[PDB]
Enzyme design. Structure first.
Site, mmCIF file in Angstrom:
data_model
loop_
_atom_site.group_PDB
_atom_site.id
_atom_site.type_symbol
_atom_site.label_atom_id
_atom_site.label_comp_id
_atom_site.label_asym_id
_atom_site.label_seq_id
_atom_site.Cartn_x
_atom_site.Cartn_y
_atom_site.Cartn_z
ATOM 1 N N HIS A 60 0.877 -1.169 0.000
ATOM 2 C CA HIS A 60 0.000 0.000 0.000
ATOM 3 C C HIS A 60 0.903 1.204 0.000
ATOM 4 C CE1 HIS A 60 0.966 0.540 4.289
ATOM 5 N NE2 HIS A 60 0.666 -0.730 4.451
ATOM 6 N N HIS A 63 8.370 1.457 2.913
ATOM 7 C CA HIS A 63 8.966 1.978 4.117
ATOM 8 C C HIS A 63 10.455 1.930 3.990
ATOM 9 C CE1 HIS A 63 5.272 0.381 6.561
ATOM 10 N NE2 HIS A 63 5.007 1.584 5.932
ATOM 11 N N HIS A 90 8.351 6.983 5.926
ATOM 12 C CA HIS A 90 7.586 6.583 4.749
ATOM 13 C C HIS A 90 6.768 7.767 4.228
ATOM 14 C CE1 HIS A 90 4.463 6.127 7.914
ATOM 15 N NE2 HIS A 90 3.703 6.584 6.942
ATOM 16 N N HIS A 92 3.037 9.424 1.928
ATOM 17 C CA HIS A 92 1.635 9.357 1.530
ATOM 18 C C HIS A 92 1.374 10.210 0.305
ATOM 19 C CE1 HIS A 92 -0.164 7.096 4.819
ATOM 20 N NE2 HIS A 92 0.805 7.606 5.551
ATOM 21 N N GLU A 102 -2.143 13.685 4.026
ATOM 22 C CA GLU A 102 -3.166 13.194 4.939
ATOM 23 C C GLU A 102 -3.698 14.331 5.797
ATOM 24 O OE1 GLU A 102 -2.699 8.529 5.453
ATOM 25 O OE2 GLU A 102 -1.543 9.660 6.967
ATOM 26 N N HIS A 115 6.117 11.031 6.670
ATOM 27 C CA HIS A 115 5.991 10.567 8.064
ATOM 28 C C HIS A 115 7.279 9.908 8.611
ATOM 29 C CE1 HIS A 115 1.307 10.618 7.767
ATOM 30 N NE2 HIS A 115 1.799 11.805 8.107
ATOM 31 N N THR A 195 -2.622 6.308 11.004
ATOM 32 C CA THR A 195 -3.566 6.787 9.986
ATOM 33 C C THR A 195 -4.186 5.663 9.147
ATOM 34 O OG1 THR A 195 -1.722 7.418 8.541
ATOM 35 C CG2 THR A 195 -2.653 9.124 9.936
ATOM 36 N N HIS A 196 -3.454 4.562 8.992
ATOM 37 C CA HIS A 196 -4.042 3.326 8.484
ATOM 38 C C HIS A 196 -4.019 2.264 9.593
ATOM 39 C CE1 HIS A 196 -0.069 1.389 7.831
ATOM 40 N NE2 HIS A 196 0.317 2.533 7.291
HETATM 41 C C1 LIG Z 1 7.323 -1.079 6.954
HETATM 42 C C2 LIG Z 1 6.958 -1.530 8.350
HETATM 43 O O1 LIG Z 1 7.447 -0.811 9.434
HETATM 44 C C3 LIG Z 1 8.137 -1.500 10.422
HETATM 45 C C4 LIG Z 1 7.332 -2.165 11.515
HETATM 46 O O2 LIG Z 1 6.792 -1.296 12.455
HETATM 47 C C5 LIG Z 1 5.763 -1.681 13.332
HETATM 48 C C6 LIG Z 1 5.797 -2.889 14.009
HETATM 49 C C7 LIG Z 1 4.756 -3.234 14.876
HETATM 50 C C8 LIG Z 1 4.803 -4.553 15.597
HETATM 51 F F1 LIG Z 1 4.439 -4.424 16.875
HETATM 52 F F2 LIG Z 1 3.967 -5.425 15.030
HETATM 53 F F3 LIG Z 1 6.050 -5.015 15.502
HETATM 54 C C9 LIG Z 1 3.691 -2.362 15.066
HETATM 55 C C10 LIG Z 1 3.665 -1.154 14.391
HETATM 56 C C11 LIG Z 1 2.513 -0.188 14.575
HETATM 57 F F4 LIG Z 1 2.453 0.158 15.874
HETATM 58 F F5 LIG Z 1 1.365 -0.741 14.156
HETATM 59 F F6 LIG Z 1 2.752 0.879 13.808
HETATM 60 C C12 LIG Z 1 4.701 -0.813 13.531
HETATM 61 C C1 LIG Z 2 4.326 -0.746 10.445
HETATM 62 C C2 LIG Z 2 3.707 0.602 10.431
HETATM 63 O O1 LIG Z 2 4.433 1.584 10.390
HETATM 64 N N1 LIG Z 2 2.284 0.740 10.459
HETATM 65 C C3 LIG Z 2 1.671 2.047 10.441
HETATM 66 N N2 LIG Z 2 0.307 2.258 10.564
HETATM 67 N N3 LIG Z 2 -0.021 3.687 10.502
HETATM 68 C C4 LIG Z 2 1.116 4.457 10.351
HETATM 69 S S1 LIG Z 2 1.093 6.233 10.234
HETATM 70 N N4 LIG Z 2 0.559 6.660 8.765
HETATM 71 O O2 LIG Z 2 1.291 6.873 11.535
HETATM 72 O O3 LIG Z 2 2.413 6.771 9.834
HETATM 73 S S2 LIG Z 2 2.458 3.511 10.271
HETATM 74 ZN ZN LIG Z 3 1.933 7.614 7.389
#
Ligand SMILES: *CCOCCOc1cc(C(F)(F)F)cc(C(F)(F)F)c1
Ligand SMILES: CC(=O)Nc1nnc(S(N)(=O)=O)s1
Ligand SMILES: [Zn+2]
Length: 256
Positions: A60, A63, A90, A92, A102, A115, A195-196
């Site tokens: 979607h 990152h 990342h 938007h 956003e 963000h 936000t998502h």
């Molecule tokens: C591209 C993904 O970003 C890195 C992972 O970041 C998150 C990890 C987790 C988790 F707890 F599952 F490890 C949660 C979150 C959240 F809080 F949902 F943003 C981000």
């Molecule tokens: C893994 C992870 O980063 N999940 C997120 N869900 N909402 C986000 S927001 N738009 O604050 O930046 S990031």
């Molecule tokens: Zn974002």
């Protein structure tokens, strides 16, 4: 979940019910109605280029990820007693150039939004512990204004060739994402959510009052990214921004 019409922001509630909660982001910042709060220190960003790990395509969006096992890259200052740890940043964007952001300010929608995500390294021991916590996450929001090619975008835009399909992943090293921030870090803050999905009402928002520039073509590079997995068709990432949400009595503070 997704940003398509059959799984979008509108169907999120009938899925994650918090989306109709009281602390949803993004929001419209009405300036006539902000409050200068005096306890707001500036924001200090101290990132380390060598915590830069990898870039990866999550379908979607994409990152850029950082190493988060010591306070090598911190967000300090602002409304924060504690130091927050950088782990990701990342973007938007939207269908066209006139609304990819956003957050809106005074009803003005921008072309995209940056963000930069931190978690409470110092009250919690992990980011999974931190995610659900009201005081667990801190995200900096930087509005993106369609104009000149941003130079510091390029070093990351140059890297999406290697993460074109959903799940595709590439190493990304030596980067100071502070280079992406405006000259002034004058900002607003309000209590809000992710936000998502999962949509956790756990984000303390920092919104730089200054925009940065992105060019119309750079935005196109965003939509040359693919929602799909390799070998499957091509469905490009066209938009990934949520509509603004009701403030529900929340207070937006200015640092100025
Ligand atoms: C591209 C993904 O970003 C890195 C992972 O970041 C998150 C990890 C987790 C988790 F707890 F599952 F490890 C949660 C979150 C959240 F809080 F949902 F943003 C981000
Ligand atoms: C893994 C992870 O980063 N999940 C997120 N869900 N909402 C986000 S927001 N738009 O604050 O930046 S990031
Ligand atoms: Zn974002």
């Amino acid at each position: 979940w997704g940003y398509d019409d059959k799984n979008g922001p509108e169907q999120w509630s009938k899925l994650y019910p918090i989306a109709n909660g009281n602390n949803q982001s993004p929001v419209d910042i009405k300036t006539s109605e902000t409050k200068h709060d005096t306890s707001l220190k500036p924001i200090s960003v101290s990132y380390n280029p060598a915590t830069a790990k990898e870039i990866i395509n999550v379908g979607h969006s994409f990152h850029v990820n950082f190493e988060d096992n010591d306070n090598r890259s911190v967000l300090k200052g602002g409304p924060f007693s504690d130091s927050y740890r950088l782990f990701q940043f990342h973007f938007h964007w939207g269908s066209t150039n006139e609304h990819g952001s956003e957050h809106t300010v005074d009803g003005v929608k921008y072309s995209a939004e940056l963000h930069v995500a931190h978690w409470n390294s110092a009250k919690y021991s992990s980011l999974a512990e931190a995610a659900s916590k009201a005081d667990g996450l801190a995200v900096i929001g930087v509005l993106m204004k369609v104009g000149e090619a941003n130079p510091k975008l390029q070093k990351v835009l140059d890297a999406l060739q290697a993460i074109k399909t959903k799940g595709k992943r590439a190493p990304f090293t030596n980067f100071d994402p502070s280079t992406l921030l405006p000259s002034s870090l004058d900002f607003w803050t309000y209590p809000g959510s992710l936000t998502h999905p999962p949509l956790y009402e756990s984000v303390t928002w920092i919104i730089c009052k200054e925009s940065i520039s992105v060019s119309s073509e750079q935005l196109a590079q965003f939509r040359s990214l693919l929602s799909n997995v390799e070998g499957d068709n091509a469905v490009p990432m066209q938009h990934n921004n949520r509509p603004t949400q009701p403030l529900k009595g929340r207070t937006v503070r200015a640092s100025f």
